[PDB]
Tab-separated table of all heavy atoms in Angstrom:
chain	number	residue	atom	x	y	z
A	147	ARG	N	79.073	132.510	119.159
A	147	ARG	CA	78.253	131.861	118.147
A	147	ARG	C	78.870	130.531	117.722
A	147	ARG	O	80.000	130.474	117.234
A	147	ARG	CB	78.073	132.776	116.930
A	147	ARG	CG	76.915	132.390	116.010
A	147	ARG	CD	77.391	132.268	114.567
A	147	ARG	NE	78.294	131.125	114.387
A	147	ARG	CZ	78.988	130.866	113.278
A	147	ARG	NH1	78.903	131.674	112.221
A	147	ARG	NH2	79.738	129.771	113.211
A	148	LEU	N	78.129	129.457	117.945
A	148	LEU	CA	78.592	128.133	117.582
A	148	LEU	C	77.826	127.680	116.356
A	148	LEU	O	76.783	128.245	116.011
A	148	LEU	CB	78.363	127.157	118.731
A	148	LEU	CG	78.707	127.676	120.126
A	148	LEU	CD1	78.584	126.522	121.126
A	148	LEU	CD2	80.117	128.270	120.136
A	149	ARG	N	78.368	126.682	115.680
A	149	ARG	CA	77.756	126.126	114.492
A	149	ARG	C	77.558	124.648	114.751
A	149	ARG	O	78.412	124.004	115.361
A	149	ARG	CB	78.675	126.333	113.295
A	149	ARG	CG	78.244	125.575	112.067
A	149	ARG	CD	79.076	125.985	110.868
A	149	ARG	NE	78.899	125.060	109.753
A	149	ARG	CZ	79.072	125.377	108.471
A	149	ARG	NH1	79.387	126.619	108.118
A	149	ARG	NH2	78.892	124.449	107.537
A	150	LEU	N	76.413	124.117	114.346
A	150	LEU	CA	76.127	122.709	114.539
A	150	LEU	C	75.781	122.144	113.172
A	150	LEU	O	74.880	122.645	112.483
A	150	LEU	CB	74.961	122.535	115.516
A	150	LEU	CG	74.338	121.140	115.620
A	150	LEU	CD1	75.325	120.176	116.264
A	150	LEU	CD2	73.010	121.205	116.405
A	151	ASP	N	76.553	121.152	112.746
A	151	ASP	CA	76.345	120.517	111.448
A	151	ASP	C	75.491	119.287	111.676
A	151	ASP	O	75.616	118.624	112.724
A	151	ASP	CB	77.690	120.121	110.805
A	151	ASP	CG	78.572	121.320	110.466
A	151	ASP	OD1	78.177	122.146	109.616
A	151	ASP	OD2	79.674	121.425	111.039
A	152	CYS	N	74.673	118.938	110.684
A	152	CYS	CA	73.775	117.798	110.810
A	152	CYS	C	73.290	117.349	109.441
A	152	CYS	O	73.646	117.941	108.432
A	152	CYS	CB	72.566	118.196	111.666
A	152	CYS	SG	71.668	119.627	110.997
A	153	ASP	N	72.511	116.274	109.415
A	153	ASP	CA	71.959	115.749	108.181
A	153	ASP	C	70.542	116.264	108.026
A	153	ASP	O	70.121	116.589	106.917
A	153	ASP	CB	71.885	114.216	108.222
A	153	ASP	CG	73.239	113.544	108.422
A	153	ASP	OD1	74.266	114.061	107.931
A	153	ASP	OD2	73.261	112.471	109.054
A	154	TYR	N	69.807	116.317	109.146
A	154	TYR	CA	68.409	116.750	109.168
A	154	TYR	C	68.120	117.662	110.338
A	154	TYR	O	68.787	117.601	111.370
A	154	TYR	CB	67.487	115.532	109.282
A	154	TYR	CG	67.655	114.534	108.158
A	154	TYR	CD1	68.319	113.327	108.361
A	154	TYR	CD2	67.153	114.809	106.885
A	154	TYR	CE1	68.481	112.419	107.328
A	154	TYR	CE2	67.305	113.913	105.842
A	154	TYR	CZ	67.971	112.721	106.072
A	154	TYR	OH	68.113	111.829	105.034
A	155	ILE	N	67.095	118.483	110.183
A	155	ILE	CA	66.671	119.403	111.235
A	155	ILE	C	65.163	119.169	111.505
A	155	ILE	O	64.361	119.021	110.572
A	155	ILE	CB	66.906	120.880	110.820
A	155	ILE	CG1	68.387	121.105	110.476
A	155	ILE	CG2	66.453	121.818	111.940
A	155	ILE	CD1	68.699	122.487	109.856
A	156	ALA	N	64.799	119.011	112.772
A	156	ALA	CA	63.397	118.825	113.139
A	156	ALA	C	62.982	120.101	113.849
A	156	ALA	O	63.550	120.463	114.877
A	156	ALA	CB	63.232	117.626	114.052
A	157	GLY	N	62.058	120.834	113.237
A	157	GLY	CA	61.570	122.071	113.816
A	157	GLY	C	60.439	121.734	114.764
A	157	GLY	O	59.316	121.465	114.334
A	158	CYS	N	60.763	121.697	116.051
A	158	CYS	CA	59.828	121.386	117.126
A	158	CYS	C	59.760	122.593	118.075
A	158	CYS	O	59.605	122.454	119.292
A	158	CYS	CB	60.352	120.154	117.884
A	158	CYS	SG	60.435	118.651	116.884
A	159	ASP	N	59.816	123.781	117.486
A	159	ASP	CA	59.818	125.021	118.231
A	159	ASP	C	58.512	125.800	118.393
A	159	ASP	O	58.519	127.017	118.626
A	159	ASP	CB	60.964	125.937	117.744
A	159	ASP	CG	61.020	126.106	116.226
A	159	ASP	OD1	60.217	125.506	115.485
A	159	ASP	OD2	61.900	126.866	115.767
A	160	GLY	N	57.388	125.105	118.271
A	160	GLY	CA	56.104	125.758	118.480
A	160	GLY	C	55.665	126.811	117.489
A	160	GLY	O	56.380	127.142	116.546
A	161	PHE	N	54.512	127.409	117.773
A	161	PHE	CA	53.916	128.393	116.881
A	161	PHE	C	54.809	129.560	116.480
A	161	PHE	O	54.822	129.975	115.328
A	161	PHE	CB	52.585	128.896	117.447
A	161	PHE	CG	51.752	129.639	116.445
A	161	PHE	CD1	51.326	129.012	115.280
A	161	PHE	CD2	51.434	130.978	116.634
A	161	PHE	CE1	50.606	129.702	114.321
A	161	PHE	CE2	50.712	131.674	115.676
A	161	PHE	CZ	50.301	131.030	114.514
A	162	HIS	N	55.559	130.087	117.439
A	162	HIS	CA	56.450	131.200	117.184
A	162	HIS	C	57.888	130.792	116.957
A	162	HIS	O	58.781	131.621	117.107
A	162	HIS	CB	56.401	132.174	118.349
A	162	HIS	CG	55.118	132.928	118.430
A	162	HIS	ND1	54.163	132.669	119.387
A	162	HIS	CD2	54.606	133.894	117.634
A	162	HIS	CE1	53.112	133.438	119.171
A	162	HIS	NE2	53.356	134.189	118.112
A	163	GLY	N	58.127	129.534	116.619
A	163	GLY	CA	59.496	129.107	116.401
A	163	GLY	C	60.168	129.706	115.174
A	163	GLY	O	59.514	130.288	114.298
A	164	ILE	N	61.478	129.516	115.075
A	164	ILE	CA	62.252	130.029	113.951
A	164	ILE	C	62.114	129.143	112.699
A	164	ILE	O	62.148	129.639	111.576
A	164	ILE	CB	63.747	130.201	114.364
A	164	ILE	CG1	64.542	130.874	113.244
A	164	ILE	CG2	64.372	128.852	114.742
A	164	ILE	CD1	64.027	132.250	112.858
A	165	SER	N	61.855	127.854	112.913
A	165	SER	CA	61.708	126.859	111.849
A	165	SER	C	60.771	127.222	110.726
A	165	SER	O	61.173	127.252	109.563
A	165	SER	CB	61.206	125.531	112.418
A	165	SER	OG	62.114	125.029	113.365
A	166	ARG	N	59.494	127.377	111.043
A	166	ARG	CA	58.542	127.697	109.999
A	166	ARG	C	58.904	129.009	109.309
A	166	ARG	O	58.664	129.168	108.134
A	166	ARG	CB	57.112	127.752	110.554
A	166	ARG	CG	56.034	127.769	109.468
A	166	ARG	CD	54.629	127.700	110.071
A	166	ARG	NE	54.290	128.940	110.770
A	166	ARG	CZ	54.251	129.081	112.094
A	166	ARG	NH1	54.506	128.055	112.914
A	166	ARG	NH2	53.929	130.257	112.601
A	167	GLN	N	59.520	129.927	110.036
A	167	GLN	CA	59.896	131.212	109.454
A	167	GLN	C	61.078	131.093	108.515
A	167	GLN	O	61.384	132.036	107.788
A	167	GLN	CB	60.317	132.197	110.531
A	167	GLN	CG	59.296	132.558	111.545
A	167	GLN	CD	59.929	133.379	112.655
A	167	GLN	OE1	60.743	134.285	112.395
A	167	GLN	NE2	59.601	133.046	113.899
A	168	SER	N	61.807	129.988	108.616
A	168	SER	CA	62.972	129.776	107.773
A	168	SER	C	62.651	129.169	106.408
A	168	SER	O	63.533	129.048	105.568
A	168	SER	CB	64.010	128.926	108.515
A	168	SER	OG	64.360	129.536	109.747
A	169	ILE	N	61.412	128.744	106.191
A	169	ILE	CA	61.028	128.194	104.902
A	169	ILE	C	60.581	129.408	104.077
A	169	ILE	O	60.031	130.357	104.623
A	169	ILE	CB	59.859	127.203	105.040
A	169	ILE	CG1	60.253	126.042	105.964
A	169	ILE	CG2	59.417	126.703	103.675
A	169	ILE	CD1	59.122	125.051	106.255
A	170	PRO	N	60.951	129.463	102.784
A	170	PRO	CA	60.543	130.599	101.945
A	170	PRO	C	59.015	130.702	101.991
A	170	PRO	O	58.309	129.740	101.670
A	170	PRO	CB	61.039	130.192	100.559
A	170	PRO	CG	62.288	129.405	100.883
A	170	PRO	CD	61.839	128.548	102.043
A	171	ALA	N	58.517	131.863	102.416
A	171	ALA	CA	57.081	132.089	102.548
A	171	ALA	C	56.289	131.611	101.349
A	171	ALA	O	55.257	130.972	101.508
A	171	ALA	CB	56.785	133.541	102.829
A	172	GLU	N	56.788	131.884	100.155
A	172	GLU	CA	56.101	131.467	98.941
A	172	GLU	C	55.950	129.957	98.790
A	172	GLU	O	55.179	129.482	97.947
A	172	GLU	CB	56.805	132.031	97.706
A	172	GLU	CG	56.688	133.533	97.567
A	172	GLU	CD	57.226	134.036	96.236
A	172	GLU	OE1	56.537	133.860	95.203
A	172	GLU	OE2	58.333	134.610	96.219
A	173	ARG	N	56.668	129.188	99.593
A	173	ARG	CA	56.566	127.747	99.461
A	173	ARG	C	55.459	127.117	100.320
A	173	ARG	O	55.024	125.993	100.062
A	173	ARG	CB	57.933	127.094	99.715
A	173	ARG	CG	58.260	126.019	98.692
A	173	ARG	CD	59.759	125.890	98.439
A	173	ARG	NE	60.336	127.099	97.845
A	173	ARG	CZ	61.544	127.166	97.281
A	173	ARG	NH1	62.327	126.092	97.216
A	173	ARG	NH2	61.987	128.327	96.809
A	174	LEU	N	54.913	127.898	101.245
A	174	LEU	CA	53.887	127.403	102.155
A	174	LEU	C	52.501	127.987	101.948
A	174	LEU	O	52.367	129.159	101.573
A	174	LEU	CB	54.293	127.734	103.593
A	174	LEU	CG	55.632	127.254	104.134
A	174	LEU	CD1	55.931	127.988	105.430
A	174	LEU	CD2	55.611	125.742	104.340
A	175	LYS	N	51.472	127.154	102.133
A	175	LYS	CA	50.095	127.645	102.097
A	175	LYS	C	49.506	127.465	103.500
A	175	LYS	O	49.586	126.401	104.102
A	175	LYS	CB	49.237	127.045	100.967
A	175	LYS	CG	49.117	125.543	100.857
A	175	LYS	CD	48.551	125.188	99.461
A	175	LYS	CE	48.116	123.710	99.297
A	175	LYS	NZ	49.167	122.669	99.526
A	176	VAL	N	49.114	128.593	104.070
A	176	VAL	CA	48.552	128.713	105.414
A	176	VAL	C	47.013	128.764	105.415
A	176	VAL	O	46.389	129.455	104.587
A	176	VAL	CB	49.102	130.018	106.086
A	176	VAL	CG1	48.578	130.183	107.498
A	176	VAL	CG2	50.620	129.982	106.095
A	177	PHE	N	46.420	127.968	106.300
A	177	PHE	CA	44.975	127.897	106.494
A	177	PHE	C	44.868	128.248	107.963
A	177	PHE	O	45.424	127.554	108.815
A	177	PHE	CB	44.472	126.474	106.256
A	177	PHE	CG	44.864	125.920	104.924
A	177	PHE	CD1	46.147	125.412	104.723
A	177	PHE	CD2	43.990	125.970	103.858
A	177	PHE	CE1	46.545	124.969	103.484
A	177	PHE	CE2	44.380	125.527	102.609
A	177	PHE	CZ	45.668	125.027	102.423
A	178	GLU	N	44.147	129.311	108.271
A	178	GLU	CA	44.027	129.768	109.649
A	178	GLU	C	42.635	130.333	109.959
A	178	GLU	O	41.969	130.863	109.066
A	178	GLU	CB	45.092	130.845	109.867
A	178	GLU	CG	44.996	131.638	111.140
A	178	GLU	CD	46.228	132.487	111.355
A	178	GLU	OE1	46.780	132.994	110.349
A	178	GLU	OE2	46.654	132.624	112.522
């Protein structure tokens, strides 16, 4: 397990990516 430090993260991982899942659900409003 490696760690990568950065200033910003761009979630470009598609529909099933980890990015959107990492934002607190209560903070997002989904229209589907």
